[PDB]
Amino acid sequence: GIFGAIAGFIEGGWTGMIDGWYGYHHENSQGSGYAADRESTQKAIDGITNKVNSIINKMNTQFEAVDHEFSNLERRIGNLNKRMEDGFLDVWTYNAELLVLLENERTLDLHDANVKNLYEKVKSQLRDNANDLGNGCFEFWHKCDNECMESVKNGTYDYPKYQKESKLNRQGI
Amino acid sequence: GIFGAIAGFIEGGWTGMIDGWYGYHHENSQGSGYAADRESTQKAIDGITNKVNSIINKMNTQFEAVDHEFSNLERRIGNLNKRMEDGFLDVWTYNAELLVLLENERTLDLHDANVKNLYEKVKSQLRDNANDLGNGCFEFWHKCDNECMESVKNGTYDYPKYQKESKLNRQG
Amino acid sequence: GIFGAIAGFIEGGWTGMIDGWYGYHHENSQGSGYAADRESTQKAIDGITNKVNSIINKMNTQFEAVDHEFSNLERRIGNLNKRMEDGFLDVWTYNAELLVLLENERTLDLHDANVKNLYEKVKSQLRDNANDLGNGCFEFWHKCDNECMESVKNGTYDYPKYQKESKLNRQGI
Amino acid sequence: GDKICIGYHANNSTTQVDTLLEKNVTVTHSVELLENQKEKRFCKIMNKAPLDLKDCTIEGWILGNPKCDLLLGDQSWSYIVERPNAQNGICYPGVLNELEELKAFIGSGERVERFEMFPKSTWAGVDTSRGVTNACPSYTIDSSFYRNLVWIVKTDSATYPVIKGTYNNTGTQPILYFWGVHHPLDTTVQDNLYGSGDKYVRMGTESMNFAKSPEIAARPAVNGQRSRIDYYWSVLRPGETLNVESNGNLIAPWYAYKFVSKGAVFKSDLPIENCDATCQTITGVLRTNKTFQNVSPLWIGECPKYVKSESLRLATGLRNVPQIAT
């Protein structure tokens, strides 16, 4: 994956997370689950929808071909008309086909970039209070509450509050 | 934003930073201020400029509409001419408008990537001598002089020179 | 570069690394050398190759110009032919040229992302067992023989195995 | 200890898109933009039925072939359907001049009203009722003629005098009309039907001039005729006036059309059924909201863009990498 996250250092997706494109999986003494980051799921949806509508709009004209006949002394204009119509047809097929390949490449990158940025938003909150497992998972060095789970998600995790419990654990080990 | 810095984890921009696209804000006993990274800003200006000139250059050719007259036994070739000129008009209108939408999306991301790479360049110098807050800011574990700040921007910041002092206060 | 690695925080390339686009340079009591990371290089080669083939594929139609003659009561349709053919020539020149400029910018960004991804992968395995020297170079706080080197390149580095040795050496300096 | 993990959505989708970098990529969400499906029939556009020429061609309809009687009079169409195998066209052999230009003018219309332009009594001293030919049977008569033309011949005694007619276009609508020049095979047939001596057909308006005289010679038999007729058409502008003058060989205008002006003429076998369409292609109706189509470049109404593509599927979702279950 270009940003490295999707099918990358995060090896797979979650059929269990069904209310969003990106998000979190927690496990705590109080249970476990899959919950989506709403804000960045929503922004991606607005963005992607806009992309589909802009393409539909820009594609809203048509070239129109004609039923005109030509006599046996009009072989040159008749062939002119054919090469022109084939010409605009090739140009537009090209534009549509190429645009789809290019935009698909960039749409998948956008998703990759959004996963990657969520992962970084959490890695910088937790610092040495948690241990990086592989695959986009962190193991806390301290007991983490449901409320603590929410503080990581909503971006108000309180690092100092657990710095001592965490460090005592970190290397009592 | 797509590299996540602009309108991302650096929630807003600086009206105060006037001389550059990307910059440093510092606070210290001697005061606080704004300073543009001269090199990455110029490197961006050069790139954006070249992009605008490449687009203008590619768009140099024009299609010549003519307005010849056609008689009342020339409905077919008169119609042919009109469909032809409207065909090329439609294609160049599509090309300009889509190019602009696409290019604007990408130019915003360049700015986002550039800010992001400045942050990581600083973070990489500072190491444990400073604490990375959420928002593109670093709180030092030592007293940072105006020399010290200017060295952070220069890329000539001396990490070992402050290591001991930082370890202490980080322990305190 | 945009991802900041190529000609970025990693200043130059390696003429010595001859079997890959992206690679490691190692040095140990056992020896020094260059080795391409095969997985990421092969992925990039397939992607670049698909892209070249897509572009060749989509460009594989031609506008048809003609040798037809016109008489001097046919100035208007003779000019219609001329403006028609020039018209398609200009549209195709524009497409090929603009495409090559755009794809060239993106293909360089792709290489720059893989280098950066390769560096972030290694950095996150090593953690504090190694010291960042600057130019994408890590100095181990412990002995790292060939098996341990291969270990890093393979993605199976054992941070616990060396964490005591690294910590004691770190304190010493 | 407690885990927090970052991740992304997966699902059961097997729908793939293509990419500049990668070909068969399964994604969680996507939109096909192209339409490949068609109802194989003609329908009304703007709640207006098309005109079915049936066994008749455009020439047969508008010149008034006797076998084309069912289509006689006023007509309102949204488009025209000419059947490929239709056999009723020009029955008395000859050239319809500027034919392709006529077919394009008629296609740009939506309505015609048929009306007598030159009553037979317009031409004094000549026989207007001797018609008539076996090259132009109706269904009930072996020897008829075009309903919109009069084949004028000299009266039972000689001779064919100068005949003259004028029509003034008082109306707000252009008039589409027709005439012809008879080209006999022999001087004998020339002498029998018309006078002796040099014959002409001349016609003019404020903006148009016409002049032609008989080109007598035997051509290959076609519907039993070695003679020929040159047919002509023109359009009398509102405010314009038509003078006609001839001393022989005139196939006179009789009835003409007040003409009301996209337009299309489809050559096709498709059935015309009782239905409605927003889009009609020459190979069928498109009932769709898609952006592109690959059915046909030839249409009428609001249609998606025609392209030669099989599929144009846009990724909206991320790459689908669901957990493997055994």
Place this chain on the structure above:
Amino acid sequence: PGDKICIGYHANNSTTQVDTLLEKNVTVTHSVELLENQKEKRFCKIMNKAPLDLKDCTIEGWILGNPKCDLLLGDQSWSYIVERPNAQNGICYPGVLNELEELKAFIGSGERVERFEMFPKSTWAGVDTSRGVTNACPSYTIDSSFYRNLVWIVKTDSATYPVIKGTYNNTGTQPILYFWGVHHPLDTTVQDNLYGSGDKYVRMGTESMNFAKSPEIAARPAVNGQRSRIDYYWSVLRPGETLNVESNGNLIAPWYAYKFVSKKGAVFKSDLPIENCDATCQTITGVLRTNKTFQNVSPLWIGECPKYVKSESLRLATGLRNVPQ
């Protein structure tokens, strides 16, 4: 408590907006508009050269020499032509100028004409040349005149109208654009009166061109009091080509013709004023004075102009997303 250094990005008082594929109406710190939507509503000089203002004359009126159209009669140089839409002085004696559209296209090419006497009246022997005037072609000063470039040749007071002949040999380096006609009376009376009795022809020929026509007598609807017609013709006598002209009646003869010198040609049909300005780019609806690379004004122009597109705006972001505090 501790000193801080922060990384960040510029912001400003900008309210200028751009669109991207992912988002509409994104305020951006710096942008560049590529499309020009403004014009000066007038016609200016182009390469320091004024255009030809036909004014009251159609292109037909001007090059045939309609009596009302002298004062355009000299020589001409132009960077482009302006035909005013309602101009009333064109073909004065009713008839058709054959290949009109193709003649308009040839005049449109070329920058200058020099008017000269191709066939002096003396060319045709045995025939009147002073009587060929009509009330359908008034000048401003007299009620019955004729095109300055043609001679309506008519029978001598004593019949008959003999075979007349004329040749001209192009020795110059420039092509010659010239005109002629064939008279078509409404009657055999008018035909006998003006010309002889007998079959009349008008024949012309060069090394590469062949013309032959005979009178077609009939009465057409009255136009400018005339139920007769003239078929007018035009052609181009190449450098080194000789023109031979032979007729025994109904010839409307070439009198004056044009040395014709041929870039992008332009015949604008418009009503805009022609002011004493100078310009780089002229369109049919006005002047564009601009550095922008697109324009939404007109697809028809002369000079160096931006590419025409239907867009209302083409603004590239150059700076970044503007989110000031």
Place this chain on the structure above:
Amino acid sequence: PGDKICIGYHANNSTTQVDTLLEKNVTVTHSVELLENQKEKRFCKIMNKAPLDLKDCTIEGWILGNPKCDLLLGDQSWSYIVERPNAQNGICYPGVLNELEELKAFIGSGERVERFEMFPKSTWAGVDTSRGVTNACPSYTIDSSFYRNLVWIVKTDSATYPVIKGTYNNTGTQPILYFWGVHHPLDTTVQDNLYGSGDKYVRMGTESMNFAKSPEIAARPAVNGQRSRIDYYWSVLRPGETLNVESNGNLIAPWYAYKFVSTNKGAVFKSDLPIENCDATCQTITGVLRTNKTFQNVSPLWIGECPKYVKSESLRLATGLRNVPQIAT
């Protein structure tokens, strides 16, 4: 001091550059050039079929049978036609070949022709055949000759040109390309001498075609020493169609015609380039391309399979990365 591991990238000796939207003249380690600009300045066989070399003769010269064009006379099969920019032998008796451009177009499309006698000289009764010669049309061996596919028919010694008639019925499966004429004398003197007196005509027709012309008599500027002119005409007689010919006088009759095999694109190159015993897949008007590339510098005009034509000087795609080799010193 301590064990190093470093992350980095390939560099190399390459000095090849590419442009991007953001930067010009970027040296990259690997690239592919997509545009071809080399050609062989010659004409080769397409689909193994040799082109037709008109040589001195023009297209008019060829199909009317200019007597000097006998090298080309009879059957021809070609993949395309080459007409030299300064061929001398075309229409030798001054006149117009009507609808010429549309003819050149028809011949291009345009695979093979079989020559054959359409109307034998005997077809026309009461007229002289053997006197249709001019000094405007020599062969390389006789000072006064005439087109190998036409008959200039003269009145016989009796000063009457009878009505002549000719019929040809096309029972074959191939269209027939054929030619005829109408003579226009400078004089009524020459008119009287060569044909009858009184109004003359040339009429012809088929099931779908009509033609009628009469002589337009007038003195014209001399060309090849002729002040008279001939109007040449051409048509195509579809399978199953029949032609009827009828003339009072001034007919230049069809004599030999062509069975015409259509193709199957077709081209006519005006050029002075050599023709050689070589094979091509792609033939432009200025040369053979022999290439794998996707885009072509050389010409918009070609027959066969060519890369797409563009104005570009170069279209090099980066495949490798930015090349930053170490300074060796």
